[PDB]
Design a binder for this molecule. Sequence first.
Ligand SMILES: *[C@@H]1O[C@H](CO)[C@@H](O[C@@H]2O[C@H](CO)[C@@H](O[C@@H]3O[C@H](CO[C@H]4O[C@H](CO)[C@@H](O)[C@H](O)[C@@H]4O)[C@@H](O)[C@H](O[C@H]4O[C@H](CO)[C@@H](O)[C@H](O)[C@@H]4O)[C@@H]3O)[C@H](O)[C@H]2NC(C)=O)[C@H](O)[C@H]1NC(C)=O
Ligand SMILES: *[C@@H]1O[C@H](CO)[C@@H](O[C@@H]2O[C@H](CO)[C@@H](O[C@@H]3O[C@H](CO[C@H]4O[C@H](CO)[C@@H](O)[C@H](O)[C@@H]4O)[C@@H](O)[C@H](O[C@H]4O[C@H](CO)[C@@H](O)[C@H](O)[C@@H]4O)[C@@H]3O)[C@H](O)[C@H]2NC(C)=O)[C@H](O)[C@H]1NC(C)=O
Ligand SMILES: *[C@@H]1O[C@H](CO)[C@@H](O[C@@H]2O[C@H](CO)[C@@H](O[C@@H]3O[C@H](CO[C@H]4O[C@H](CO)[C@@H](O)[C@H](O)[C@@H]4O)[C@@H](O)[C@H](O[C@H]4O[C@H](CO)[C@@H](O)[C@H](O)[C@@H]4O)[C@@H]3O)[C@H](O)[C@H]2NC(C)=O)[C@H](O)[C@H]1NC(C)=O
Ligand SMILES: *[C@@H]1O[C@H](CO)[C@@H](O[C@@H]2O[C@H](CO)[C@@H](O[C@@H]3O[C@H](CO[C@H]4O[C@H](CO)[C@@H](O)[C@H](O)[C@@H]4O)[C@@H](O)[C@H](O[C@H]4O[C@H](CO)[C@@H](O)[C@H](O)[C@@H]4O)[C@@H]3O)[C@H](O)[C@H]2NC(C)=O)[C@H](O)[C@H]1NC(C)=O
Ligand SMILES: *[C@@H]1O[C@H](CO)[C@@H](O[C@@H]2O[C@H](CO)[C@@H](O[C@@H]3O[C@H](CO)[C@@H](O)[C@H](O)[C@@H]3O)[C@H](O)[C@H]2NC(C)=O)[C@H](O)[C@H]1NC(C)=O
Ligand SMILES: *[C@@H]1O[C@H](CO)[C@@H](O[C@@H]2O[C@H](CO)[C@@H](O[C@@H]3O[C@H](CO)[C@@H](O)[C@H](O)[C@@H]3O)[C@H](O)[C@H]2NC(C)=O)[C@H](O)[C@H]1NC(C)=O
Ligand code: I5B
Ligand code: I5B
Ligand code: NAG
Ligand code: NAG
Ligand code: NAG
Ligand code: NAG
Ligand code: NAG
Ligand code: NAG
Ligand code: NAG
Ligand code: NAG
Ligand code: NAG
Ligand code: NAG
Ligand code: NAG
Ligand code: NAG
Lengths: 734, 740
Amino acid sequence: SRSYPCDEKKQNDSVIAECSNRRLQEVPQTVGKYVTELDLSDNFITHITNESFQGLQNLTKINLNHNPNGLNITDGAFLNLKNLRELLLEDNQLPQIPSGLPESLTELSLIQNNIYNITKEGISRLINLKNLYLAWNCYCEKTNIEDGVFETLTNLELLSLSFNSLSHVPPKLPSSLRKLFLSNTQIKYISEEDFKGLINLTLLDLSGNCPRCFNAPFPCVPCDGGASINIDRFAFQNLTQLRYLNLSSTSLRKINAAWFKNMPHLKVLDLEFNYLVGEIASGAFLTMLPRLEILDLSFNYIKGSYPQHINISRNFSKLLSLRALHLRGYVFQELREDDFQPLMQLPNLSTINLGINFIKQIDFKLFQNFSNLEIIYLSENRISPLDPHSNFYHFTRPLIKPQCAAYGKALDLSLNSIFFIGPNQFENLPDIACLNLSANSNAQVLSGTEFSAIPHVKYLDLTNNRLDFDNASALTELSDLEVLDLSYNSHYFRIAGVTHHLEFIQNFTNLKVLNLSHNNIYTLTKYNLESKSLVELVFSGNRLDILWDNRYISIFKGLKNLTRLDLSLNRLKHIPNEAFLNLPASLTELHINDNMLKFFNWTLLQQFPRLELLDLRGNKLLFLTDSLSDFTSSLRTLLLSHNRISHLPSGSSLKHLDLSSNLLKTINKSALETKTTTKLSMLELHGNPFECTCDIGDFRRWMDEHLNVKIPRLVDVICASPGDQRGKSIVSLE
Amino acid sequence: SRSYPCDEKKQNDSVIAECSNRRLQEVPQTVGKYVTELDLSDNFITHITNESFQGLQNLTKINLNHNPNVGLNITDGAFLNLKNLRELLLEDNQLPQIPSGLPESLTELSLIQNNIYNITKEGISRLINLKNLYLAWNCYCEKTNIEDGVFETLTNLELLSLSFNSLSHVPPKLPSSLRKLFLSNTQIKYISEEDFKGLINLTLLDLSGNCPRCFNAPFPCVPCDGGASINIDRFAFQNLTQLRYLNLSSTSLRKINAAWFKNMPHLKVLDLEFNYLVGEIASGAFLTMLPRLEILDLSFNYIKGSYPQHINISRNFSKLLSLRALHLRGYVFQELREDDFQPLMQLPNLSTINLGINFIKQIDFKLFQNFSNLEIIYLSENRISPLDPHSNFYHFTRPLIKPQCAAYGKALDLSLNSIFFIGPNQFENLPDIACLNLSANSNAQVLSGTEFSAIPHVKYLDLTNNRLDFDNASALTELSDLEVLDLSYNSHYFRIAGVTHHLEFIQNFTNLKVLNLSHNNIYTLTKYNLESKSLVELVFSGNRLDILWNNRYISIFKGLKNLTRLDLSLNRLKHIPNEAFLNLPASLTELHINDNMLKFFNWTLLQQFPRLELLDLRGNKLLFLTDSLSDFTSSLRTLLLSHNRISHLPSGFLSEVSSLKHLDLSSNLLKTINKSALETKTTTKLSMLELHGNPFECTCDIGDFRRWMDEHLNVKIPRLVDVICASPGDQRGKSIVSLE
Ligand SMILES: *[C@@H]1O[C@H](CO)[C@@H](O[C@@H]2O[C@H](CO)[C@@H](O[C@@H]3O[C@H](CO[C@H]4O[C@H](CO)[C@@H](O)[C@H](O)[C@@H]4O)[C@@H](O)[C@H](O[C@H]4O[C@H](CO)[C@@H](O)[C@H](O)[C@@H]4O)[C@@H]3O)[C@H](O)[C@H]2NC(C)=O)[C@H](O)[C@H]1NC(C)=O
Ligand SMILES: *[C@@H]1O[C@H](CO)[C@@H](O[C@@H]2O[C@H](CO)[C@@H](O[C@@H]3O[C@H](CO[C@H]4O[C@H](CO)[C@@H](O)[C@H](O)[C@@H]4O)[C@@H](O)[C@H](O[C@H]4O[C@H](CO)[C@@H](O)[C@H](O)[C@@H]4O)[C@@H]3O)[C@H](O)[C@H]2NC(C)=O)[C@H](O)[C@H]1NC(C)=O
Ligand SMILES: *[C@@H]1O[C@H](CO)[C@@H](O[C@@H]2O[C@H](CO)[C@@H](O[C@@H]3O[C@H](CO[C@H]4O[C@H](CO)[C@@H](O)[C@H](O)[C@@H]4O)[C@@H](O)[C@H](O[C@H]4O[C@H](CO)[C@@H](O)[C@H](O)[C@@H]4O)[C@@H]3O)[C@H](O)[C@H]2NC(C)=O)[C@H](O)[C@H]1NC(C)=O
Ligand SMILES: *[C@@H]1O[C@H](CO)[C@@H](O[C@@H]2O[C@H](CO)[C@@H](O[C@@H]3O[C@H](CO[C@H]4O[C@H](CO)[C@@H](O)[C@H](O)[C@@H]4O)[C@@H](O)[C@H](O[C@H]4O[C@H](CO)[C@@H](O)[C@H](O)[C@@H]4O)[C@@H]3O)[C@H](O)[C@H]2NC(C)=O)[C@H](O)[C@H]1NC(C)=O
Ligand SMILES: *[C@@H]1O[C@H](CO)[C@@H](O[C@@H]2O[C@H](CO)[C@@H](O[C@@H]3O[C@H](CO)[C@@H](O)[C@H](O)[C@@H]3O)[C@H](O)[C@H]2NC(C)=O)[C@H](O)[C@H]1NC(C)=O
Ligand SMILES: *[C@@H]1O[C@H](CO)[C@@H](O[C@@H]2O[C@H](CO)[C@@H](O[C@@H]3O[C@H](CO)[C@@H](O)[C@H](O)[C@@H]3O)[C@H](O)[C@H]2NC(C)=O)[C@H](O)[C@H]1NC(C)=O
Ligand SMILES: COc1cc2c(C(=O)N3CCN(C)CC3)n[nH]c2cc1-c1ccncc1
Ligand SMILES: COc1cc2c(C(=O)N3CCN(C)CC3)n[nH]c2cc1-c1ccncc1
Ligand SMILES: *[C@@H]1O[C@H](CO)[C@@H](O)[C@H](O)[C@H]1NC(C)=O
Ligand SMILES: *[C@@H]1O[C@H](CO)[C@@H](O)[C@H](O)[C@H]1NC(C)=O
Ligand SMILES: *[C@@H]1O[C@H](CO)[C@@H](O)[C@H](O)[C@H]1NC(C)=O
Ligand SMILES: *[C@@H]1O[C@H](CO)[C@@H](O)[C@H](O)[C@H]1NC(C)=O
Ligand SMILES: *[C@@H]1O[C@H](CO)[C@@H](O)[C@H](O)[C@H]1NC(C)=O
Ligand SMILES: *[C@@H]1O[C@H](CO)[C@@H](O)[C@H](O)[C@H]1NC(C)=O
Ligand SMILES: *[C@@H]1O[C@H](CO)[C@@H](O)[C@H](O)[C@H]1NC(C)=O
Ligand SMILES: *[C@@H]1O[C@H](CO)[C@@H](O)[C@H](O)[C@H]1NC(C)=O
Ligand SMILES: *[C@@H]1O[C@H](CO)[C@@H](O)[C@H](O)[C@H]1NC(C)=O
Ligand SMILES: *[C@@H]1O[C@H](CO)[C@@H](O)[C@H](O)[C@H]1NC(C)=O
Ligand SMILES: *[C@@H]1O[C@H](CO)[C@@H](O)[C@H](O)[C@H]1NC(C)=O
Ligand SMILES: *[C@@H]1O[C@H](CO)[C@@H](O)[C@H](O)[C@H]1NC(C)=O
């Protein structure tokens, strides 16, 4: 009962069917009637008729996005499915809203289509709609929205008409609306009557109307003569429940304070890509936002201006509930303590985003003066030594990595002019626990005194630099250091009998993660790496081939507590038997992928009784041992994809085996002896040049007898020979 | 008489046989006896015997470098039979000792990158005619065993290079004829007066890499324990009166004794990079001893962990009257004021100032007007804000600024700085700049014809790797004399839907000759016609011509009436429309449509281009070639069609096309060349035909083509070892010329 072409799985007391990206030309009739969620996205389906979803009465969600990669859907093709609640029809080239849609629809998405008319024949009958996404359609000179087409939808909570030539706000909208998205809708004027009966609205998006074109991923055209969006003085007078307001890219050169007169619950205000340098210095509207938590005034700079200081209005002190302030792209030369005086008394202000400001000098003592700062983002400055469902205007990704941020106070000084750690670099700073010094052309010879002013740093990112850590005292001032990242570090001052010297590692009593990736380590001097606390070591992108010379045979034996070792991208052709035996016995994960391994001694796995994962992908291995069970009794996952294995040898802990992208021609009956209690739950085999003759017949019987072994991508398990079966899956054989 | 495997060529009344990189396992005996220079480098030769160069009496030069390429067994006296051998190169051969029985007629001998640990008299002393001796990279053994007086017999030696060898001490008893002594990275920590006693004719002394300051060395680097410097005696250079070149780079020098240059009045080049001379640059007692010095290099002499406000240049820098170039890279300082460079302002010949990689935050650009003859101002890798064993491994030898830029006049390199926008005071108080480099500055300036007004005589402008906006028709129009504009890899930052790209600014130039709009990602344009009467070269590579030509941009380049070179490569072009191709300038002499996805090319359209001499169509998917090319073009001299899918050559392709001298048909799908296409009875002047990388058929089909090669010896076919036939199995791998 192995399903094809859908990889079905149980989810929240209901079986679902993942059938996406399988090159299907039409709706498959081999889908179980018990499924509730069918996903057929990224396929070549061209027609949707009444017989497409025949007998699937329990279908509550259908995803038919990107079909074909136009779509001919007949009238009333989905009406027969009485339980259909969520229907996604994105990127289908539909010229109109499909007719005969079932009234049970609570979620309908018709994004990236050719829908130019919003008719009552396809919308008004859907009285149970809660979410309606009609983005990217007339992006027709204007979208034809029928008068009162949404009035019948008394249950609508979200209406997204973004990226459409609207020009005017649609009249007669349902009072139940809570989220109104109208971004890039060409609406140059907002009146009081546009949001008359929307007293329960909690979100209003009016961004991209009269935009300031700055690195837009979509077409951008200004309002002729630098015109701003004309919002009426009483346009938001009846929006008492408004929490989110997006006025990004609206060429605003003045903010009327009366807009927030009856808006006391406003939590997020977006004002990026405007011309509010003057409004930041005066700020009349700032005294009207006592419950605002996120204020974003990014990329509001004056073109061709590089002022000495940032002019922050005193009225910024009236934003008592503020938690995050994003001031990217303001462009200024110096940040003094006096400049950020209106922000120092805000109790909840934990995030200050000053990225891409080209600040040459910062008085870092002003950060001590803040009451609850947790994130200080200063990336892309000049500090010197000593997808339609996306937010396209706001920096939504975490400014600093959540793993770094979890340790405590975070400071990001990456992409700055810190070419060496100065003696006064970290003086007068708060108790920093997370620090980013990435991409700074830093060639500091770490001698054990550089980070003394911030000694409680636990997560230190020193990637993309030219640092020298040959000294044993390097970074020892950070006693509580737990994660050190030296990814892509290029040694700038190599000594013949010194570089690379990793003696500083054994000084740390709590360092758990160390990333020495892409360091170009081809020489070592002690020659071993000792540490009683180190758990994870990333030695990828180095030269282990050169090291493994009989002096570096026990290079990692000192790391007694090491559980994860990544030896990928090391140009390893053959790991010596003595060198492999000197690896820590405590290892649970070993990644020796993307190398040039021609042979691998499986016999050596007997000295690793805790090894649960062995990654050997992207190699040139040809032979597999016939007695693996004798060497390992704990190996749960074995990845061997993109190798040259052309034969599987004959003959309980192994649950996952990856044999995809290999040279396997067939699987014989002798290797299918599963009379033993082997708990195999996953077996990948896609990309093998199989023989669809009577040789694969014995393997086909094993697949039907052992249904618990999951074989993914059944459409990609293709047999190359013979010509009659070239291209077809191995499961569609006589 | 077509030679194989050597591509022989005549040069100055003597033949020279190029036989390098041909995968030869042994010395070929099919080399003409008339040749004088044989080059068999980069091959798999394993043995050199007396029969290797048999009958080649006229051989004056033999190059056997890199043999084999992943040792070399040379018998004793294997080269003695060649009485005229003057130059012998034996580099990277894993020779354990200097070969014995070498001919006495050797004037040049190179044994670099070998395992030679002993310099014996049995292999060197007999060569009394040696002028150049290169023995670099050998004991790089605890020390090189140099026999006492092994070089004394070599009375004609002018150059001795013992660099990259564990020497520890300067070899005693050196020939008085020596003029160039190279001893770089030789582990010599002490120099005495007796080391250069009888070397009064020495013009070059290299002592670099002895007690080094390890900074980005491409070879092993180890300091002298406890930061020790090279100990040069007070009278070590007392008898070197003819010294012109002195290399003391990477010698950990923290003090320069002025007495070293007491009897050295001809010193022209002094190298002092990678030392600790910050204090010596501020005091400089030795500076008053160099009146004829032209090149002084004090680069990467910085104090680690120090970022001083100013550069301390001694007043004694005014005593370097003959100075032409000063290289002060890696000093590390925050500000350059006019007063700081006061000792250099009165030097008449000072034309080059190298201040690269200094992290200077502010420069008073006015100071450059006080200089009498500044031609090159290199300031790359600073912080200015808006408003191979045969190599010199320590000195920046490449031209700081591209010669084509520098040729215009005063050059200023401000690349890799922090000029994120052109400030209003950016170029004020500068001299009359003709060459300006502003590459890679994250520059998002909206060009409006008012930015370069302070230096309006800029002729070569480099604005590469920036995010500039030149949509205004007035962009760069204040630079009236602009001749070369480089806008490569420019990523627009403020795209307006129906405005970008607006290239109407090009029309306002009366002297612009070269324009490079490569990798600009131009997929939409605004009239949509580019006009110019002076433009000669246009590089439109790395753009989206496929989108533009698929009906508003059909005559995109017709306005460029004087255009001679057009590079339309890397534009993802599958099919150039017939109307779009006909609208190309008729004045075109070179047309490069390479590295595209062209499936078809209309050869008929070449009739409207009577001056087209070069057609580049490499890296394409073309299958068909017209059988009447002579009817369409009468001037096409070079036709490049390599890396295409052409599987058949039509009959009469070579006929009636007398202008064609070069045809590249390599890396194609040609199986064979028939007799019908070899009709060369016409006066066709074909001088070069490339065919390497074709899956040829070594059967009787290729026999008729073989006869054409022997009859027409004037047609040069390069890489004969790479013209390999894939079929049949018996001839798979072998060249087509080694057939029955
Ligand atoms: C102008 O400003 C407003 C206000 O900030 C922006 O509005 C936001 O827009 C984004 C993008 O459309 C919204 O993000 C989406 O939210 C959905 C709902 O999230 C809530 O509910 C789920 C449970 O259903 C919770 O898990 C979640 O934490 C929230 O509580 C999500 O379902 C969406 O997820 C999908 O997209 C993302 C991103 O591609 C994927 O990673 C997911 O896997 C998934 O496919 C998505 O996160 C956001 O909710 C809106 N804000 C509010 C308050 O509703 C405007 O977008 C902005 N305009 C412009 C042009 O920038
Ligand atoms: C230098 O080397 C270090 C050490 O290897 C690297 O740091 C690690 O980077 C990886 C990403 O490559 C991090 O792993 C990821 O962590 C995410 C967050 O984990 C928390 O949240 C999830 C829930 O979302 C919890 O389950 C989890 O327990 C944590 O609390 C995960 O979301 C990621 O999972 C996704 O990707 C993986 C595959 O990468 C899938 O298997 C998952 O199913 C899922 O799709 C992922 O686990 C890791 O946490 C980092 N370690 C540390 C200590 O920070 C550096 O990135 C590396 N530097 C460079 C430049 O290469
Ligand atoms: C310490 O400082 C000294 C002084 O500056 C350096 O000495 C120079 O070293 C370089 C590298 O070995 C020398 O360069 C070579 O010069 C040969 C002679 O050049 C003259 O003669 C030819 C004609 O025969 C002229 O064309 C030329 O302009 C000169 O007048 C060349 O034949 C060499 O060419 C070969 O190598 C180059 C570079 O790889 C290739 O491009 C060529 O095709 C060719 O294969 C080469 O140019 C230089 O001459 C030395 N100076 C002097 C005055 O002799 C030391 O090298 C330096 N030490 C360190 C370690 O940096
Ligand atoms: C943007 O676009 C411009 C215009 O195309 C580029 O600038 C040109 O770059 C080319 C290189 O691609 C330059 O061409 C080279 O010039 C060298 C110097 O030429 C002078 O000196 C030689 C003698 O050495 C004379 O014969 C000649 O007449 C000149 O007086 C030549 O030495 C080069 O020749 C070598 O390479 C070519 C192949 O490239 C071989 O055919 C030769 O045999 C030889 O091996 C070459 O001709 C050209 O001069 C530049 N022009 C200008 C105006 O600067 C930019 O580089 C490009 N920008 C970017 C970022 O790509
Ligand atoms: C320390 O600072 C550096 C530099 O700011 C951080 O690197 C940046 O990390 C982010 C998130 O991983 C990268 O963003 C992603 O980039 C890709 C590629 O362009 C893009 O497709 C994604 O949409 C996303 O924007 C960013 O590229 C990367 N920057 C660089 C220059 O590599 C680093 O993560 C910081 N470390 C910590 C501990 O926070
Ligand atoms: C204007 O300034 C830029 C930046 O300094 C110049 O670009 C640089 O040009 C040099 C010489 O062509 C490049 O050097 C070579 O780089 C390769 C690759 O790393 C290296 O293998 C060679 O040994 C050599 O060093 C250099 O990379 C390049 N820099 C960048 C960032 O692209 C440009 O040439 C200047 N233009 C003029 C008109 O002088
Ligand atoms: C916000 O104003 C800018 C921002 C930028 C950027 C930028 O966005 N960067 C982020 C990505 N990074 C890799 C490079 C730096 N680059 N040049 C700029 C220039 C300006 C600017 C333009 C005109 N007047 C004043 C300032
Ligand atoms: C000359 O002294 C340096 C030079 C450098 C460089 C550098 O050489 N660069 C050229 C290549 N470029 C791509 C990046 C910048 N990077 N960091 C440095 C740091 C220092 C320095 C170290 C210690 N005390 C003072 C100064
Ligand atoms: C739908 O699911 C229910 C159980 O939730 C079951 O009783 C019913 O028979 C199913 N119908 C179909 C057509 O699968
Ligand atoms: C600050 O945040 C807390 C929740 O963490 C919230 O209860 C409090 O009211 C906020 N402060 C102000 C002044 O609103
Ligand atoms: C904090 O800033 C105030 C001014 O805003 C200043 O008076 C005070 O001295 C600063 N805090 C400390 C600890 O110096
Ligand atoms: C390590 O740094 C300390 C402090 O600067 C220094 O005393 C010591 O000599 C350095 N170690 C080495 C091997 O140079
Ligand atoms: C090994 O590392 C883990 C995680 O850091 C730690 O909990 C454990 O105590 C360590 N064991 C030893 C013996 O160091
Ligand atoms: C595997 O390792 C064992 C123990 O070192 C050794 O006896 C055996 O010969 C090795 N096998 C191979 C193929 O190297
Ligand atoms: C060497 O060249 C001369 C002419 O320069 C010629 O007379 C002589 O015969 C040639 N010898 C050989 C062996 O080719
Ligand atoms: C300056 O250079 C010229 C050659 O261009 C030379 O003749 C003159 O002597 C040099 N000046 C001095 C003061 O040596
Ligand atoms: C040149 O510099 C001197 C000081 O060194 C100054 O007095 C003079 O005015 C400067 N020249 C010009 C043209 O201003
Ligand atoms: C173009 O440049 C001219 C001259 O400076 C200026 O007057 C004009 O306003 C600029 N165009 C735009 C669109 O700003
Ligand atoms: C064409 O360009 C060349 C080189 O710039 C110039 O000499 C010639 O006069 C130009 N001809 C015309 C008609 O502009
Ligand atoms: C080539 O161009 C001529 C003139 O436009 C046209 O008649 C002919 O059909 C074209 N050939 C092809 C193959 O397009």
